Amino acid sequence: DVDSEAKKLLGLGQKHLVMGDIPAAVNAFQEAASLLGKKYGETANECGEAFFFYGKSLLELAREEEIGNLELAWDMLDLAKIIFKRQETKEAQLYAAQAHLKLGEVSVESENYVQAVEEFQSCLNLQEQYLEAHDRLLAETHYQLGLAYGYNSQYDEAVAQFSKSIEVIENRMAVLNEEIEELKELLPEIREKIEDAKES
Amino acid sequence: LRDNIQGITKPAIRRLARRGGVKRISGLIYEETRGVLKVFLENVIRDAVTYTEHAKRKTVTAMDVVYALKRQGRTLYGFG
Amino acid sequence: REIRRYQKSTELLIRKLPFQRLVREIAQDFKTDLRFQSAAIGALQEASEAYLVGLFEDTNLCAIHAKRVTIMPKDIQLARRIRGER
Amino acid sequence: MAKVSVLNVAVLENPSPFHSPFRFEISFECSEALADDLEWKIIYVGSAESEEFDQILDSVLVGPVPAGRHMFVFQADAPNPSLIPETDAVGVTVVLITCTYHGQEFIRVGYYVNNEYLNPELRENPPMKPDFSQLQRNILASNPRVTRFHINWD
């Protein structure tokens, strides 16, 4: 019953994450995470997935009480990150990678870049650890990492991350031969970021 | 006593610790923390002041410092 | 749940004036005729905090790896080496 | 910036007894043909309390280095148990890999290393002098640390 209601609450929550309703998503996760931590304990890993999505909606809701949302989003992402860092499976580790991704993005909006690049460097370590050479998640993080650098005035290092990201797209554009439209139109986003990065 | 002058309080030290995920510290942390920082500042001050004499400045500013720290070393959590 | 905190970005965890006198005496072991622009100090300030938060990130790691919670100086020395500058 | 870029390192057959040789799979990329020599090192930190107990395990000197992707595997024998202070012998320590473009360190990758007993009683009550044959070396592949110093590449 608790396990049953919680899983759909996570469903309806991400279904508010498509709907565009941010607070509703946030509260779907609050109680969901509330039910899990109150049943299994705040240490238990069965809280992790709800913990992640909880810390995920609060980040979206952060857009002048933003830092407060930054607090709780950081905590839940940090709780989920160690819940996953414990489990030695592929899924949980990549979930800790995703947790590190969001942690890093929680830092750039926090304008805490030094830690942001770190969490992106951490997410990349675990993705690289596990994913394959032509996986779109590597470009999901190289890109992110380049901008965070740009935000930190490390413009040369920023461009390089961008290049690794675009190359991740181009190389998967080879086995896709023997989503091609989808890659074509998000390449302009990165080239614009490239031309602007060291331009400063 | 002059060699005992400090630049960071004990409150700050535990603050910096917990934000790196540290949960508890031993009593000797405060000295070690203060010991290694001095070294850091030693290594840094020298370079920035060096460039102040290299840039032949007197009121040395950050523009020296940041070059003096790009000279110190950047630790990242992976290879990508 | 004793897990990592975070900053606000508004100001520093280090007072500049106790910091500055330390800067002063460290630099005066080298020479006796020196002066320092407040900008230079603030630069050293943030650099200090940065290095500190880095080693604490590593210090807790190895401390984690021995079955332990309280951190020992050896862990600090160790994190200094896994960076490595001595 | 740098004319060389270490793409990735990989620690192999981890964990293993204390006495077994290290095995890393290293891969880098030279942006240009390199004239001078590249020197890779493995260093085992014998004591945290003093770099004096650093033990340079192996080193390879390569030069000139072409441009492009390179990969090799660095194997180095286990560190000398006779040179380790017995305090530092069982516990957590560090191992390092460094490269050197004609005499200057431009990169230092580092790992924690946990040496444990697995015999249940030896972890329970360890012998005064460490039984290195009975020790196991678990390097931390999960958490590398790469420190890059900027140098002259001319």
Numbering used by the authors:
A (entry chain H): 38 to 100, 170 to 284, 299 to 320
B (entry chain C): 22 to 101
C (entry chain B): 49 to 134
D (entry chain D): 1 to 154
List passages from the publication reporting this PDB structure:
NASP is a major histone chaperone for H3–H4 dimers critical for preventing histone degradation. NASP and its homologues share an atypical tetratricopeptide repeat (TPR) domain. They constitute the SHNi-TPR (Sim3-Hif1-NASP interrupted TPR) family, predicted to have four TPR motifs with the TPR2 motif being interrupted by a long acidic region, a capping helix region immediately following the TPR4 motif, and a disordered C-terminal region containing a nuclear localization signal (NLS). Here, we report the crystal structures of the sNASP dimer, the complex of sNASP with an H3 α3 peptide, and the sNASP–H3–H4–ASF1b co-chaperone complex.
We successfully solved a 2.85 Å crystal structure of the covalent sNASPc-8G-ASF1b–H3–H4 heterotetramer, in which sNASPc indeed adopted a monomer conformation. Comparisons of the sNASPc monomer and dimer structures reveal that the central 4 turns (residues 285–298) of the long α89 helix in the dimer structure had transited into a disordered loop in the monomer structure. As a result, α89 separated into two helices, α8 and α9, in the monomer structure with α9 being folded back as a canonical capping helix. Interestingly, the structure of the H3–H4–ASF1b part within the sNASPc-8G-ASF1b–H3–H4 heterotetramer is highly similar to the reported structures of the ASF1–H3–H4 heterotrimer. The α3 helix of H3 is sequestered and bound by ASF1b, thus the H3 α3-binding groove on sNASPc is unoccupied, consistent with observations in a previous biochemical study. Moreover, sNASPc binds only to the αN region of H3 and, as expected, the interaction between sNASPc and ASF1b is bridged by the H3-H4 dimer. Notably, the αN region of H3 adopts an extended loop conformation, also observed when H3 is bound by factors that modify or bind K56 (49,50), but distinct from the α-helix it forms within the nucleosome structure. The extended αN region of H3 interacts with several conserved residues from the α4 and α6 helices and the loop connecting the α5 and α6 helices (Loop56) on the convex surface of sNASPc. The side chain of H3 Tyr54 penetrates into a pocket surrounded by Ile173, Leu176, Glu177 and Trp180 in NASPc α4 and Ser216 in sNASPc Loop56, with its aromatic ring establishing prominent stacking interactions with the side chain of sNASPc Trp180, and its hydroxyl group forming hydrogen bonds with the main chains of sNASPc Ile173 and Glu177. To test the role of conserved residues for the sNASPc-H3 interactions within the sNASPc–H3–H4–ASF1b and sNASPc–H3–H4–ASF1a heterotetramers, we used the GST-ASF1a–H3–H4 complex to pull down sNASPc wt and mutants. As compared to the binding of sNASPc wt, the sNASPc mutants E177A W180A D181A (EWD3A), L185A I188A, and E224A E225A disrupted interactions, while the sNASPc mutants W180A and N218A Q221A reduced binding to different extents (lanes 2–7 in Figure 3F).
